[model samples]
Target: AFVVTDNCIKCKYTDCVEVCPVDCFYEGPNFLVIHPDECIDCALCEPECPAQAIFSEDEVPEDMQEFIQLNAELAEVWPNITEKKDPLPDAEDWDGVKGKLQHLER
Candidate 1:
């Protein structure tokens, strides 16, 4: 399983969506997440993320453990997003910014 972390919160870069063969990505107000059960462990989407927000379940950072659960929870509620789309207005500015969970739109 791959999890979407804080770096994706506001950036919402959709590049990862386009490469996911299983269409496991879900769209939130300002972020994207992977449906844990739907991901095929292909690792294709991992490198596509401009924000470097996607991580394998076992390799996810300690602080980002919450995101593993968050991704699963939100994936159930958020709509699936398979196509790439424009990122948020301040995506570049927020890239690499720490503690971005507070800024998550939804």
Candidate 2:
């Protein structure tokens, strides 16, 4: 499974959702998450993320490891988001901002 990390907290870029072969992504108020059980592990969504947020479970950064559980937890309840959509208004400004988890909308 791929984890969506803090970089996506406020960015909410849908680029990764566009390329996922299995439509494993779920939408949150300010971010996206991958359904761990639904992900095919195709590696397609990783490079498509403008925020560079997606990561394979094993390769996920140490600091972002918490997202592995977060993604799975969120995906179970959030609506699935398959189509591409515009990012958050401040996505560009938020990109690469550290400690974005504090700003996660849910």
Candidate 3:
């Protein structure tokens, strides 16, 4: 499974949805979660993310560890997304920003 971490909270470039061969990405207001159970571990979406926020389950950065659970929790509630959309209007500004968990909308 791949986890969408803090950097993705506000950046949400969303290219990941289109690259996934499965419907594993769940869309939140300003973040996206990869459904851990449905994930194929294909590694496609990890590179698709411009924010560089997607990480392998076990290789997830230590500081962003909570995003492993965060992805699972939010994926269960958010709607499945199977297409690409423009990133948030301010995505460029948020890119590489830290601690964006505080900014997640849902």
Candidate 4:
């Protein structure tokens, strides 16, 4: 399954949510996650994330350890992203983006 990584923290761009063919993504207070069961593995959402937060499960960086569980846990309660008809509210610049992602330990 595709996963949401540390790069998504507080960014919540929702661009990835827009293109997902299966609409498997879910929103949280500070991040987004893919429902493991719902994802069709089409890889459409991966490139849409401005934060570049999406990764294949096996490709997650080591330092972003918390995200694996976060994705699983958050998926349970989040509203189905597929149900929304309008775009996310902020459509503005994603906060805290930098190359900090490249520094994550493998």
Q: Give the best candidate by lDDT.
A: 1
lDDT of 2 by residue, 16-51 (tens): 987888899999999899999989899998888888
Give me the displacement of residue 60 in model 4, in angstroms.
0.4
TM-score of each predicted structure versus truth: 0.97, 0.97, 0.97, 0.75
Model 1: per-residue Cα lDDT at residue 46? 89
Model 1 lDDT on a 0 to 1 scale: 0.91
User: What is the Å distance of residue 49 in model 4 from its true position?
Assistant: 0.6
Off by over 4 Å in 1: none
Which residue segments of model 4 deviate by more than 4 Å? Answer: 83-106
Scored by CA lDDT, what does every candidate get?
0.91, 0.90, 0.89, 0.71
For candidate 4, write residues 9-92 as lDDT tens digits: 655677887798887888766567898887888888888777778988888888776677767877898877764343335434
Instruction: Give candidate 3 regions above 4 Å deviation.
Output: none
Residue 104 of model 1: what lDDT? 76
Model 1 lDDT per residue over 1-106, tens place = 9898999988988999888899999999998989999899999988999999999999999988999999999999999998899999989999999999987776
Report the poorest 10 consecutive residues by lDDT, candidate 3.
Answer: 97-106
Count of clashing residue pairs in every prediction: 0, 0, 0, 0
TM-score, model 3 to reference: 0.97
- In terms of lDDT, the poorest run of 10 residues in model 4 is 97-106
